[PDB]
């Protein structure tokens, strides 16, 4: 793909949904990026804000097979679940 | 007045150079004299002959 | 003279440091250079095979790069042998 | 011309100095022969000066 | 925050107006680009002037080996100690020595060093009283002594 | 002492002459590498000395 | 310890042995000038490779003119702790506070002199 | 009988005739600083600039594109020594310019003060270049920094001085001796490493020239510091 | 930086490649040994590190460092020798010669791979000859040697209570 945004430069974790439409990226500093992928074209939909709390471990990402939910960990607060559609 | 044409003629026609022998002698004296500064018969012929002739 | 003047981009001419290379070479000769007592991993793992109740051969029996032309002639001689 | 005069005068002074060193009773061995550019080099026997 | 700036003519004490701009060190160079913007960031609270080069020699020898004079004692206690505000200093040793000799807190930081660079660049336009001729003549006398 | 007295004096004469003879228009085997730096690739191909 | 700080290029024990050995070799080849007065003259004539001084002169100032002259001619210089040791290396029955190794055409010590010259400048960092 | 040609660098001239000399206009007519000879044309006197002794003169004769030392400019000079090159710089910048001569050696400092007495535009600073904060009172914001200290961490010394006294968009001229940085490594390898270190600070080297005819194992790097966006 | 999971900064020591680094008993200072033979002291500022002072330059590269537990003395290992330094004036009080072979001489140079220092005054050293050696700091002389391996002994570590230590060798 020709171009990518600069904020994806150092990803801790890369995850693909059950469909190819959505791409999930965790940044080295706390941030979640959702990218809309359609026909070799990328659109940055949303950037979830860093989770509150002291960083305890490397980030881990899980996606539900329906695509509705995204679970992320790596902080002392606990595992956070995000609604992709909302 | 534009002096570009005049300056070009005076800066090119007068071409002269010192000799290489002149320049190489000047550059070596500048170097200095300190240690840091400064830069058909074989034994086979003789040995075989005395075996064959006097051996 | 075009050879005297050279144009270079700022990031390309950055290469490996020669001083760093000498540092790596010193470590290599100190640990795997002449005068040390080093064996191969194949030989080192084959010492157990000589002491087993059933003796086996070397762990890696085939040497890939010992010979290539000699390997073909052995196959040619073998095919002749079955006639 | 002046530079070439300097080179010759440096050689001449050393050869006279080298000849002056020879006027010594201490034993010596020649290790090099004299040349146009350099004087002969000698090594002297090691005795302390009393 | 008060900041102390040393020049050949005397001691200069400035006050920073926009403390928010100091947080972004990378963007601070834009504020001191022109004399209009620099006066919006800092203003001169007080300037104590050296009368002659013999007195100035007595001052700056002490400063650069981490010691303060009797006169520099008086300037600090009036301008900086009566006010309740941190004092930026370009020397960590000088800020350390001030803490014991006077009950005063000194801050040294890379953002402070960036603030020192901006004031020096806009040296004319920040002190209106001192003439350019007095600055140049005082520099020659102090340098030779 | 006679040779050295002459040698040191004309040696200083050599240094004095070299202070106003700067070997302008030197042509020799030694040629110095002059290197220019550019941020972008396009400047590198489009480089022209003149 | 208890060394005058003005003798800054103070060689350690290992370099001292290399220095005094080379000085003793230079004596055998007639390539050494002994004494502060004779050492000064070689610097003025520009025929010296390096200068060795003794750090234990009771007034140290009697040799401090030599470092100034060496910096003009760009000649390396070092200090050793004992003038008695320097005197015996020079082959003299008396203490020596300064010595100079001179320039010789065709000298066999050229490789050793160059190695010592390189070692000295390392002390100047 | 002398004919004088303008040089590409402002304030610098080249003198031909009986002498093949690079010259600058004398700021103090009738005076010689270190025994250099002088010539007059008609009213105007010039002083010869020895390339064998000076390194800036060697770079100019070597074909450098820019020196950035111009009339009416403020120059911070690191490694002033006796002031032979400082005197020619004081000629170029003229009465409007200022030269700050920093030298740590005491014997070389005594020659600077005698030179500084006769030239008003020279400001002598007998301090150590490794601590620019110890003389911040004397130096205002400057335009060009010239460094000839010949000392292994020269790059760090320049960067500390550039951060305190060099304006945005200012230029630096640095002389590098290969065997001083590392005696055993090759000259071109040493020079490239210094180029890398300059890029680590906000210094962009723009050119590099070696001083082959008058010196050996020397290079000059000219660049800009904190270039404007 | 552990929190941001990135490198805060990299600073050039300007002494060539660095072979070893040791922190002082207090965390305020850092000691660096380089290829050129110089020992450098860095003060640790709240945000970065600042170069402070150079000790006396040694003839060969410095491969291992150790601090006196009170912080007054330094031990540094190098090819064929160990150097003891005083922190107040960075001068080598003692140079200790290490024999290339155990009670013998060999053409192969001896490399001191690690140095550990005890409060009583003893220096423990491990070398490529395969022996662990005890030295006295006051006199600068060897006290005891222990031959333990036929290959290099490469690593040293001492517990906080100076009653136990551990060595690691090339044979595993």
Coordinates of C-alpha atoms in Angstrom, one line a residue, chain F:
Chain F
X1 CA 79.5 26.1 14.4
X2 CA 80.3 27.7 11.1
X3 CA 78.0 25.4 9.1
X4 CA 75.2 25.5 11.7
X5 CA 75.3 29.3 11.9
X6 CA 74.9 29.5 8.1
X7 CA 72.3 26.7 8.2
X8 CA 69.9 28.3 10.8
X9 CA 70.0 31.7 9.1
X10 CA 69.1 30.6 5.6
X11 CA 66.5 28.2 7.1
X12 CA 64.7 31.2 8.4
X13 CA 65.1 32.7 4.9
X14 CA 63.3 29.7 3.5
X15 CA 60.3 30.3 5.9
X16 CA 60.2 33.9 5.0
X17 CA 60.0 33.2 1.3
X18 CA 57.3 30.6 1.9
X19 CA 55.2 33.3 3.6
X20 CA 54.7 35.1 0.2
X21 CA 55.0 32.2 -2.2
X22 CA 51.8 30.2 -1.8
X23 CA 52.1 27.8 -4.7
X24 CA 49.2 29.2 -6.6
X25 CA 48.0 27.2 -9.7
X26 CA 49.4 24.0 -8.1
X27 CA 48.9 21.1 -10.5
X28 CA 49.9 17.7 -9.1
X29 CA 49.0 14.1 -8.6
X30 CA 47.5 15.0 -5.2
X31 CA 43.9 16.1 -5.8
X32 CA 41.7 16.8 -2.9
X33 CA 38.2 15.3 -2.6
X34 CA 35.5 18.0 -2.3
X35 CA 32.2 16.5 -1.1
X36 CA 28.8 18.2 -1.1
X37 CA 25.8 17.1 1.0
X38 CA 22.1 17.2 0.0
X39 CA 19.0 16.1 1.8
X40 CA 17.0 14.8 -1.1
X41 CA 18.0 12.2 -3.7
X42 CA 16.9 14.4 -6.6
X43 CA 19.6 17.0 -5.8
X44 CA 22.3 14.3 -6.1
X45 CA 21.7 13.4 -9.7
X46 CA 21.0 17.1 -10.6
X47 CA 24.3 18.2 -9.0
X48 CA 26.4 20.5 -11.2
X49 CA 29.7 22.0 -10.0
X50 CA 29.4 25.2 -12.0

